[PDB]
Design a protein around this ligand. Structure first.
Ligand SMILES: O=C[C@H](O)[C@H](O)[C@H](O)COP(=O)(O)O
Ligand SMILES: *C[C@H](O)[C@H](O)[C@H](O)COP(=O)(O)O
Ligand SMILES: *C[C@H](O)[C@H](O)[C@H](O)COP(=O)(O)O
Lengths: 333, 333, 333, 333, 333, 333
């Protein structure tokens, strides 16, 4: 009864996780239309990511960023043989189920789209389709995993062409893992308690409205039927798995502001499994050339001579500094 | 002049509440003119909401937003067979009585119009026409109900095309209900005390002007003849009814920033009875298509395959992020 | 003379007060010229209020707003049979004596004109002409009365077409009266002390300049010969009269941001004796229609069916939300 | 030893004070050129005030306002028979000596010109020409007198056409006089201490620079040879003289923002000896009419019927409000 | 060695100081080119100051202000017989050595040019050419002298045409001298300690970087070999010399914002030896006239009749205010 | 890694350090293209620095500044015989390895490019190519050295044409060396502790995320395998070497805002080994002239007569003041 529940939770999880492994070692490319899908595939993309506008443009446009039009996603799935992934707004369950129904290979609960739910992410374990989610540090990654993400990427700062935020997120996650490895089981439990705190945020908001103190009550269901303590337990388990593994239990990709072959190489060299690039490619002057270049960079990242030759023709990345990013997009939690 | 005022008034409450049930399961559409009224009806709207400008436009125009011109409301009631509802300024009793006299089916005391009274809402129990009111959390909803609202909706952030605020309000209300259900009667009484606090606001202002301390006096009439403690009692009663019911005693709709079929479906899927959409439809590129789409979305919300087919043609959208909403229309209390 | 002079002077207040009663139940309309005076009278205005520009325009123009040109006031008094009232700057004694000499029926010491005196209002008891004054709460109203105002109105926020500030002022006054009625005589005395505080303001400024502590000295003449304690006594008397009367001892009108018939009706329904409207009428698209409509609204305010019919044709101009009123004209004290 | 000099010292002061009395009861008009000098004289100005630009224009122009050009002052002295006064920068001794050498009848050490000395005013006693100075309260007036001013005016807010600041200054001065009259000699001495404080400002600046504490040293020469205590003594004397007199020992005029006949009347009615008006007249639409009108207003100020007839034709640009005066010219001290 | 060193320090210092005396009693004029040099000489300038742009223009141009081009300085030295002085950036030793090699008569280490060294001024004693330096108070002047300045001027606010800052600086210096004269030798030693503080600024910055407390260490070499205590001793000596002398041991000129003959006269009348004017003359409408006028003003500054005649044609000149000077240029310490 | 990796690290380090010595005594010029490379070489540049845009332009352009296109670097290495150096983003390891592969003679880890890593610099010891790094004080310089920099320069404020920041950094470094020389070994150890602090920054961020206190743990690996204490030890060694040497163990150049021959001369005269100039030359009006001039200035820096002659024709680089540098590029740490 209980044990069988626990059993499909795990067989299905492992299957979903399994899909992610297919995409490992390659580049996944944001694509807004049939053409771009083709350019992407032709350039050696392991898969494309369908959205309405690339993040750089999302930034320029302002307003609300939602799931791509169904027509567009269709058109893209038709244009290519490789897996098609698509983006949905954080917490927006309906968008995800439409995406799943449409037959996309993976759904990305994306912090670049305007979040739908201020409190919770989608509960991903309920879906058949596998999810990829963003994380700016290990707490985030673990929560996202616990909610059922089959793959995680760094958030970085999307559409900025600036690799710094991606690098920060990778280092934060990695150092946090190494810290876990140096801890006693009990200490790790404390970290698990900290990492589950965000789920309390609804509850506490409501305690405040009701003129009660903001306290965690032991039998109080917080999220999707789970008690705070229950979440702390499950997370704790995941942290232990991580301590053993030395890395994340799922495929872990670098994302955001990859603008040049060297950028991609750098991420790979930091121990990432693969690279997501949207804006770097199509906001570039020669998109197909840049595409192929980044692919070859990810395949050759440990070979400086090759990296050097790979980067001999293209004209871009473009722009957006520390000062005036105007919507710092690494917030979901 | 008997138990007449107790047992008749309750009969009337239940009647008023009764009207609201007619509209349940469907979409109510903001409409500024005869044409839009028609497109709405034709698209399967269960009812239309008459106002001068759709919220998105209200925002753009600035200045004072009042009740629609009587001519316009008339014109709209003529154009369609389904119920016509109309908006009035918070606390503006005269506007409401004119609306009622005009024979509208329901009056919305709306936080999207410029509030008329900084202290109090309209005392709705005195009206024959039934009222719908906005709420951003349970305290608000309960107060609104106590004042005689027959139906409540979430405020969301009107005219932003952003579903986040609506979702926040639904979650706050729901979690607060679950919290009530886990409470002893005495604890619930405490919450009732907290929920009645806002009525003291005009008393306290005057105490301060009078150089007295701001204190609640036991026999002091605060609002429409009621003592603070009296309000606390009635509210408490309502809370208890909620505890039993597991939901609100009246029809409860989602509103504010529904921009796409998926949005409406998400609201339905969170347990709302129905959806209000103004700006999402007529600020969209193909209003009739979007209208019918949202209707069919609300009818088919638990069927992802249908949702998917339903949103295959429309071009539509809106502005309004987070940053620079410039108005933040989620205030009435 | 002594005893005769006394007699004359005591009964003078009641006479002045008496004039105010003539205007009770109707609408007083701001008018800048002969035509507007005519339209006003024709529309059933009980009286006109002569000024250089209507408040909405006063706002737009910036700069210093003074008494209207004598020529203009003349021209207006000639154009109509009903009482002509005129505005003067707060504390500007000369402007008022010129107004009185010109034979206006009432002088309004108006917070919409640029105040002349940062410390004191005109001492109105010395005038033969009766004064109307603005008040945003009971303290203000009582002080203005004590200085000899024969009639008081709410300040509201003039020229905004927004009824909210008017409503706030009405409620603050009323609640403060109810509070008074629930008080022991001694308590009321305390309120009297609080209400007379503002007169100390020029004393204290000078104490500070002189390097002395800011203290009330018992025999020190503050205003027009009166000691602070003397003022406290007179005010206390007036408060007691209010406690008895249940309202203000003088005719009390609603003013500012009345934009539509329903607005005026609302004010009447809150227990006001009558309505001042300047901007609502002439900044409206169809001023004579709006004028007559507001008059008929005030006459028919308890009759929703009539209010409804009354409001069937007009198109009036509205502006000035909460955000960016830029002037906030509710200051005199 | 020293005996006879006292007579001399008193003698000159009284003579200087003398000249001021000639101008009492009338209007002094700012004039920038020969024509305005003429219009002014013709209109019954007792004297003209020569400057480069009228204060309103001084405001508009920004930059440094000095000393009118010598040619211009000459040209003005030629154009009229009445006394010519001229403005100089605060503390600018050279400008004053040139003005005196040029044979002006009075020098105004004016807070409307850009101050020359951040610490001290001109030591006026050393001059043969008599000085008029501004004061925004009694401390200021007394200091200015002690430095040898033969006449003082209120500062008001020059060029604003707003009488408020003038009225404030008059009230502050008057109430401070009445406060003096109610004081024991010892108390008055305290006020004298406070009023002499500003002279310490350059001493203390230097103590701070020298890393000493900011203290008053008893034998230390602050200003023009005088010890702080010495100044406190002389000031005390002047305060006593004021207590006896009930007013200032010198001719006292109202100044700044007088824009209309009623304004001038109001100042006279508050007990001022006369009125300075620059901007009110020549920034008016009909300068000669307005000029004559203000003159007749000052002659007839206690006669409302006359005031009323007097202001039957003119109309005059007047710009600036409380908000955004941008300069706030009442600072010298 | 030991005994000859002093004779030599004294000898060279005294010679350098000697040059300054040649220029005493006259006007030194900022000049950007051959023509201006000529106009200056012709007008009775005792010397010219060569720079790229006059201070008013320096302000307008923004960017970095350096030593004039060598060609320009050459061209100027050729154009005139009187001494040519030239400006260099604070602390910029190389610019000064080039100026000296070019054979200028005096170098000005100027706070109007963009400072080169945030910590220290040029050590002037090492140079054969004599230096003039700015000071806004006595501490500054003394430090500048100790570093070997042969002449000092007030900083004022350069390019503003506003004499106020010059006057402030003159007063601060003078009062601080008078304070010195009233002090015991020990007290003066304290002031010496205070005046030598700024040299510690680069030491303390480094202590903070090194994680040490900011303390003065007794044998620690702060500046050009000198220990802090050593500097306090030398400074103390100079202070004593000042106490005896009643003034500064070097020629002391007024500088900055002298815009009119009366300005220059005022400076002279405050006990300055002479006047620097750049902007006042060439930003004037009639530069040669203004130039000659200011010269003649300095020559007859105690003769009001003459000053008055001297100022009969020119206009205006220049402008700035307190508000928005945008680069307050009196800093360097 | 026992006794042979002390001597073998000495070998490679000393070789790398050796290359730097080749460039000592000359000017290194930023160059964006073939032509500038040529002009540079022709003008006596010891080496060129290849980048996409000169720092002044980097500032103007905003956006992300990365490594130069490979084509451009190639083109430059072809155009000249002297060493070609190239810039890379801080911490961007891939860019550096591509640069090294391309065969550049030196890599500059430059704070003028957009940093890639918010936590760490490239670990330079692992590279065969030698690195030059920027430092704003001794702590920085030492850390950069420990990471394996073979040469260090001051950061200054790049592209501002303002020598002040360069001078500040030189003084800060120098005074901190002198401070070191005055310290006991134990004291120096404390400085070593302080200088190693920045490495803890990513550890502590992660401790905070994990809800632990921010503490240094003794066996915890921080950077490239090293424990905090280990770094403290290595740094301490370097400090001691500095104490002996009286300067930095590597070639030390001045950089940042050198705009004129005198600037370069000043730097040399402060004891720098040579000068970097990008913007000063090519943003100048006559680049070749200015180039040769700065070279000859660095060769002749102790000869004022020569400096003087050397600076006789050129004009330019208006650049950027203290106010509104808008970027403040001296941050890496
Ligand atoms: C090489 C460096 O980027 C620059 O040359 C130095 O840091 C500053 O360059 P500039 O002298 O162009 O401001
Ligand atoms: C969908 C995902 O957010 C996207 O692929 C990455 O964040 C990339 O952002 P960018 O590479 O387009 O800047
Ligand atoms: C001048 C008089 O008080 C005026 O009519 C009121 O302020 C009403 O203003 P509004 O109704 O024109 O806003």
């Amino acid at each position: 009864m209980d044990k069988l529940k626990i059993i499909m939770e795990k067989g299905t999880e492992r299957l979903k996780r399994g899909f992610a492994k297919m995409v490992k070692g390659g580049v996944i490319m944001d694509v807004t239309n049939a053409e771009q899908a083709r350019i992407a595939e032709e350039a050696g993309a392991v898969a494309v990511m369908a959205l309405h506008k690339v993040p750089a443009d999302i930034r320029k446009a302002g307003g609300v960023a939602r799931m791509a039009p169904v027509e567009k996603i269709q058109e893209i799935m038709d244009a290519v043989t490789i897996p098609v992934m698509a983006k949905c707004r954080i917490g927006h369950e309906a968008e995800a189920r439409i995406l799943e129904a449409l037959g996309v290979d993976m759904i990305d609960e994306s912090e670049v789209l305007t979040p739908a739910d201020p409190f919770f992410h989608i509960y991903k374990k309920k879906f058949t389709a596998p999810f990829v989610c963003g994380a700016r540090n290990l707490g985030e990654a673990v929560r996202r995993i616990w909610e059922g993400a089959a793959m995680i990427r760094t958030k970085g700062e999307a559409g900025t062409g600036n690799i710094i935020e991606a690098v920060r997120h990778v280092r934060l996650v990695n150092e946090n893992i190494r810290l876990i490895q140096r801890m006693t089981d009990e200490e790790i439990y404390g970290v698990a308690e900290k990492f589950a705190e965000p789920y309390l945020r609804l509850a506490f908001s409501v305690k405040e409205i009701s003129g009660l103190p903001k306290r965690v009550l032991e039998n109080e269901p917080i999220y999707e039927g789970f008690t705070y303590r229950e979440i702390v337990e499950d997370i704790y388990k995941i942290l232990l798995e991580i301590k053993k593994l030395g890395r994340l239990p799922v495929v872990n990709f670098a994302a955001g502001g990859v603008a040049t072959p060297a950028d991609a190489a750098l991420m790979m060299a930091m121990g990432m499994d693969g690279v997501f690039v949207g804006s770097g490619i199509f906001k570039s002057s020669n998109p197909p050339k840049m595409a192929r270049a980044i692919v070859e960079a990810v395949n050759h990242w440990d070979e400086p001579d090759v990296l050097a030759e790979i980067s001999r023709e293209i004209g871009e990345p473009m722009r957006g500094q520390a000062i005036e990013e105007l919507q710092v997009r690494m917030e979901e939690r």
